[PDB]
């Protein structure tokens, strides 16, 4: 069975043909790709979920929600539909980051690491690509497998998030 | 599928007259079909177009266009008290007014509104593909209660439109359970379980006739219920996603491989079958003059005798095919085909 239709409800941001460009499902094959096809995979699903997740978060959207997701089969059994229901939530903006946890007294240069542009929007890559320079920081001075995570806390007053950050060094290495 | 059968007409079936409507619902499978309401016909496509026709001549009366997204039109058309009511699947249910196509009002609903909308008591309600059940107010649209039902992890496209009776909806879900709400404020009443090889949609209409609901889920059953409480009277191991008849002390179906069937009201029992237009993927059926009629993917109407099962008569109408339910009522008999084109078909 095809896919005969991938559908977003809830978008009001971003067009429904700009959101689904980014998927591996397709309800449509492009002609500049050959290899593609409309075939259903579960996995596939599952991964196109957390791109549309990443778009938003990517884009300030800190509440983003998928509300459900429906994948139904026609009658004939020769259609397949995807349905992806989403509350967008309103754009945040950073107010601050804040680090805490064993940084093995390296609390500067992590806090170097965490400086915020000022009325940046929040980005949910950045704040994984900053949790990726503190582990590598931390990785010049031994310590290979340091443990990060990032808890945004969300003001929908301000429409600020700030970020708590647990780092976790770990063990050194010789 | 099945190949055409030769068959002898008893009468020879015309097409009164045919309309364009913009390009239909194509291959998007939908509920999408023409309304009759006071010699007027009231029909849709899925990029947004809606007209009303002459029930006579098939002549235009007005046409207007909901996209000015595609508007994604699919459930109904429904005529309700000079209002035309429209699902669409981004979330949308329209009223326009039958004397211009006027919007009344439009009303966003909490997802893709598939079911035919069904209009009771001063409400208009909405069965969406992710499970909720809306009443809207016929005058303003504002939505007065929902209803959540359980979503199965896979299911059949499409949604149950409720039947009404004495204050409360009866609606299939997509889980294999019928269930009765009061229409009042939404108040679940009673539900009760009627049901790839485990899908269980109830897609079809429930139909209440004598305190008893009679439903049919997809892989079966069909089952008869007791109105006041939801208590299964009898069953059969049957199954479909069309409408059927209940029609003197007759049921009429057509199952999920397309045999056509009557049964006795009581206790379901088969009187005859008929299998010869297997997987040619039948519309559901309607009875005309005397007949049951339905259409096929290949765009072909059959007439079927309802005491014996027999073809009295077969029509080739349309060449994009059928798919949504014909409608017979007001003398008429009227079916749209997958380009969008509206028939009026005379026995
Ligand atoms: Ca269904």
Same mark, same amino acid.
Request: hydrophobic share 40%; glycine share 10%.
């Given at each position: 069975?095809?896919?005969?239709?991938?559908?977003?409800?809830?978008?009001?941001?971003?067009?429904?043909?700009?959101?689904?460009?980014?998927?591996?499902?397709?309800?449509?094959?492009?002609?500049?790709?050959?290899?593609?096809? +409309?075939?259903?995979?579960?996995?596939?699903?599952?991964?196109? =979920?957390?791109?549309? +997740?990443?778009?938003?978060?990517?884009?300030?959207?800190?509440? &983003?929600?998928?509300?459900?997701?429906?994948?139904?089969?026609?009658?004939?059994?020769?259609?397949?539909?995807?349905?992806?229901?989403?509350?967008?939530?309103?754009?945040?903006? $950073?107010?601050?980051?804040? /680090?805490?946890?064993?940084?093995?007294?390296?609390?500067?240069?992590?806090?170097?690491?965490?400086?915020?542009?000022?009325?940046?929007?929040?980005?949910?890559?950045?704040?994984?690509?900053?949790?990726?320079?503190?582990?590598?920081?931390?990785?010049?001075?031994?310590?290979?497998?340091?443990?990060?995570?990032?808890?945004?806390?969300?003001?929908?007053?301000?429409?600020?998030?700030?970020?708590?950050?647990?780092?976790?060094?770990?063990?050194?290495?010789? | 599928?099945?190949?055409?059968?030769?068959?002898?007409?008893?009468?020879?079936?015309?097409?009164?007259?045919?309309?364009?409507?913009?390009?239909?619902?194509?291959? &998007?499978?939908?509920? *999408?079909?023409?309304?009759?309401?006071?010699?007027?016909?009231?029909?849709?496509? +899925?990029?947004?177009?809606?007209?009303?026709?002459?029930?006579?001549?098939?002549?235009?009366?007005?046409? /207007?266009?909901?996209?000015?997204?595609?508007?994604? =039109?699919?459930?109904?058309?429904?005529?309700?008290?000079?209002?035309?009511?429209?699902?669409?699947?981004?979330?949308?249910?329209?009223? =326009?007014?039958?004397?211009?196509?006027?919007?009344?009002?439009?009303?966003?609903?909490?997802?893709?509104?598939?079911? +035919?909308?069904? /209009?009771?008591?001063? $409400?208009?309600?909405?069965?969406?593909?992710? !499970?909720?059940?809306?009443?809207?107010?016929?005058?303003?649209?504002?939505?007065?209660?929902?209803?959540?039902?359980?979503?199965?992890?896979?299911?059949?496209?499409?949604?149950?439109?409720?039947?009404?009776?004495? !204050?409360?909806?009866?609606?299939?879900?997509?889980?294999?359970?019928?269930?009765?709400?009061?229409?009042?404020?939404?108040?679940?009443?009673?539900?009760?379980?009627?049901?790839?090889?485990?899908?269980?949609?109830?897609?079809?209409?429930?139909?209440?006739?004598?305190?008893?609901?009679?439903?049919?889920?997809?892989?079966?059953?069909?089952?008869?219920?007791?109105?006041?409480?939801?208590?299964?009277?009898?069953?059969?191991?049957?199954?479909?996603?069309?409408?059927?008849?209940?029609?003197?002390?007759?049921?009429?179906?057509?199952?999920?491989?397309?045999?056509?069937?009557?049964?006795?009201?009581?206790?379901?029992?088969?009187?005859?079958?008929?299998?010869?237009?297997?997987?040619?993927?039948?519309?559901?059926?309607? $009875?005309?003059?005397?007949? *049951?009629?339905?259409?096929?993917?290949?765009?072909?109407?059959?007439?079927?005798?309802?005491?014996?099962?027999? &073809?009295?008569?077969?029509?080739?109408?349309?060449?994009?095919?059928?798919?949504?339910?014909?409608?017979?009522?007001?003398?008429?008999?009227?079916?749209?085909?997958?380009?969008?084109?509206?028939?009026?078909?005379?026995?």
């Amino acid at each position: 069975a095809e896919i005969q239709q991938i559908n977003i409800v809830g978008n009001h941001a971003f067009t429904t043909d700009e959101l689904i460009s980014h998927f591996q499902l397709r309800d449509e094959v492009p002609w500049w790709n050959v290899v593609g096809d +409309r075939k259903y995979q579960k996995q596939k699903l599952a991964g196109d =979920l957390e791109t549309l +997740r990443s778009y938003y978060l990517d884009r300030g959207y800190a509440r &983003f929600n998928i509300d459900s997701t429906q994948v139904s089969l026609t009658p004939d059994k020769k259609g397949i539909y995807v349905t992806v229901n989403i509350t967008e939530g309103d754009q945040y903006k $950073l107010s601050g980051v804040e /680090v805490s946890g064993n940084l093995a007294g390296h609390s500067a240069e992590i806090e170097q690491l965490t400086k915020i542009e000022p009325g940046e929007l929040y980005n949910g890559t950045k704040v994984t690509k900053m949790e990726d320079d503190i582990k590598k920081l931390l990785g010049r001075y031994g310590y290979a497998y340091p443990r990060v995570q990032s808890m945004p806390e969300i003001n929908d007053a301000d429409k600020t998030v700030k970020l708590r950050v647990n780092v976790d060094a770990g063990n050194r290495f010789y | 599928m099945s190949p055409l059968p030769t068959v002898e007409n008893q009468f020879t079936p015309t097409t009164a007259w045919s309309t364009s409507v913009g390009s239909g619902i194509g291959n &998007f499978y939908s509920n *999408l079909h023409p309304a009759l309401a006071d010699n007027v016909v009231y029909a849709a496509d +899925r990029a947004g177009l809606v007209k009303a026709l002459n029930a006579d001549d098939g002549k235009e009366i007005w046409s /207007v266009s909901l996209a000015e997204e595609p508007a994604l =039109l699919s459930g109904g058309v429904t005529v309700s008290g000079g209002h035309v009511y429209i699902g669409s699947e981004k979330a949308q249910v329209y009223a =326009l007014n039958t004397s211009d196509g006027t919007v009344a009002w439009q009303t966003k609903v909490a997802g893709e509104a598939l079911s +035919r909308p069904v /209009v009771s008591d001063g $409400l208009v309600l909405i069965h969406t593909s992710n !499970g909720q059940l809306q009443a809207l107010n016929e005058a303003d649209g504002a939505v007065k209660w929902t209803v959540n039902l359980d979503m199965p992890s896979l299911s059949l496209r499409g949604e149950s439109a409720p039947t009404t009776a004495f !204050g409360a909806a009866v609606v299939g879900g997509d889980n294999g359970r019928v269930s009765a709400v009061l229409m009042e404020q939404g108040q679940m009443i009673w539900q009760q379980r009627i049901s790839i090889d485990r899908l269980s949609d109830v897609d079809t209409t429930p139909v209440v006739v004598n305190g008893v609901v009679f439903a049919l889920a997809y892989n079966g059953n069909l089952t008869a219920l007791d109105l006041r409480s939801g208590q299964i009277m009898w069953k059969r191991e049957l199954g479909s996603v069309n409408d059927f008849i209940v029609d003197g002390n007759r049921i009429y179906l057509v199952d999920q491989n397309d045999r056509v069937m009557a049964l006795t009201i009581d206790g379901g029992v088969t009187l005859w079958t008929q299998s010869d237009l297997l997987h040619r993927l039948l519309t559901s059926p309607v $009875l005309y003059n005397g007949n *049951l009629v339905v259409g096929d993917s290949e765009g072909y109407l059959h007439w079927i005798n309802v005491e014996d099962g027999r &073809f009295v008569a077969q029509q080739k109408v349309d060449s994009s095919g059928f798919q949504t339910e014909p409608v017979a009522a007001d003398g008429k008999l009227l079916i749209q085909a997958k380009d969008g084109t509206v028939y009026s078909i005379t026995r």
